[PDB]
Amino acid sequence: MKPHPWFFGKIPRAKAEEMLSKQRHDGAFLIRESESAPGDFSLSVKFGNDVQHFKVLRDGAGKYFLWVVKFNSLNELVDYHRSTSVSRNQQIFLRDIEQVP
Amino acid sequence: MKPHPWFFGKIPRAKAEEMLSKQRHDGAFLIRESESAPGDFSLSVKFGNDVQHFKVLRDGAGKYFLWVVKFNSLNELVDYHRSTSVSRNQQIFLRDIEQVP
Numbered sequence: 001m002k003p004h005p006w007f008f009g010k011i012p013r014a015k016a017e018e019m020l021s022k023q024r025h026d027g028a029f030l031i032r033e034s035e036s037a038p039g040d041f042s043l044s045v046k047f048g049n050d051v052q053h054f055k056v057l058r059d060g061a062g063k064y065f066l067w068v069v070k071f072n073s074l075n076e077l078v079d080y081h082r083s084t085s086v087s088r089n090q091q092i093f094l095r096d097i098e099q100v101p
Numbered sequence: 102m103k104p105h106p107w108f109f110g111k112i113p114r115a116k117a118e119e120m121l122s123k124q125r126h127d128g129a130f131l132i133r134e135s136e137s138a139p140g141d142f143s144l145s146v147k148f149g150n151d152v153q154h155f156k157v158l159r160d161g162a163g164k165y166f167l168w169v170v171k172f173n174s175l176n177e178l179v180d181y182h183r184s185t186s187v188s189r190n191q192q193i194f195l196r197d198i199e200q201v202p
């Protein structure tokens with residue numbers, strides 16, 4: 001197993017936008033630890049000339065979700081959204097960022 | 102910025118032990134998403150011929166901690182424990198795993 005290329009920890013929201021702006025393909029994303037909401041995660045995704053931000057929500061048991069379907073881990077939430085759009089306005093599917101070697 | 106080499110998402114506790122057992126230096130670690138406690142994180146660390154597991158605890162606001170000092174993110178908790186032992190029985194400091202290229 002290898003570490004996930006999408007977990008950036010505590011990077012500012014603006015930094016996520018700076019990074020994803022340079023990505024070529026829509027869907028390029030990263031999970032970050034919110035600075036405005038300590039203890040919560042945020043999902044930042046590239047789409048066109050913009051970067052969309054989503055709150056990773058939790059149900060009463062601690063399961064994670066964006067809209068309706070929830071999971072036992074961020075890992076599963078991320079994988080589910082690689083084939084089910086994270087957006088309700090466009091078909092945007094998560095894909096790993098082209099990491100800098 | 103680059104993704105953190107310590108976040109492995111949802112990997113089994115046994116898999117974390119398998120991986121860390123191969124690491125040469127004490128302190129080599131990874132953060133994983135608990136399978137027994139969905140929504141919670143676990144910290145696995147190598148020490149000698151064993152792999153120690155810690156529950157990443159949360160306070161009422163969602164801050165993370167192992168013992169007493171708490172942080173606004175897993176990222177900060179991890180960095181704090183690179184210079185303050187995660188153990189009360191041995192001086193074990195977190196250090197990035199020697200990732201396989």
Ligand SMILES: CC[C@H](C)[C@H](NC(=O)[C@@H](CC(=O)NC)Cc1ccc(OP(=O)(O)O)cc1)C(=O)N[C@@H](CC(N)=O)C(N)=O
Nearest residue numbers: 013034035036037042052053054055056057065066067087
């Ligand atoms: C345009 C992207 C998506 C579609 C849209 N996003 C949103 O509504 C954003 C709004 C925002 O960024 N406010 C500052 C949600 C959001 C709110 C705060 C936030 O703070 P940071 O952790 O500091 O970045 C991050 C994201 C949405 O409808 N989100 C849904 C679904 C979701 N899980 O976010 C919602 N608002 O419940």
Ligand SMILES: CC[C@H](C)[C@H](NC(=O)[C@@H](CC(=O)NC)Cc1ccc(OP(=O)(O)O)cc1)C(=O)N[C@@H](CC(N)=O)C(N)=O
Nearest residue numbers: 114135136137138143153154155156157158166167168188
């Ligand atoms: C030997 C390692 C450390 C020192 C020790 N660890 C512990 O007590 C472990 C016990 C355990 O693994 N039970 C199965 C805590 C622990 C408990 C459950 C667990 O489940 P998984 O997410 O499925 O792996 C992981 C770790 C401890 O005293 N931990 C403290 C501090 C902490 N934050 O874990 C505690 N138990 O509160």
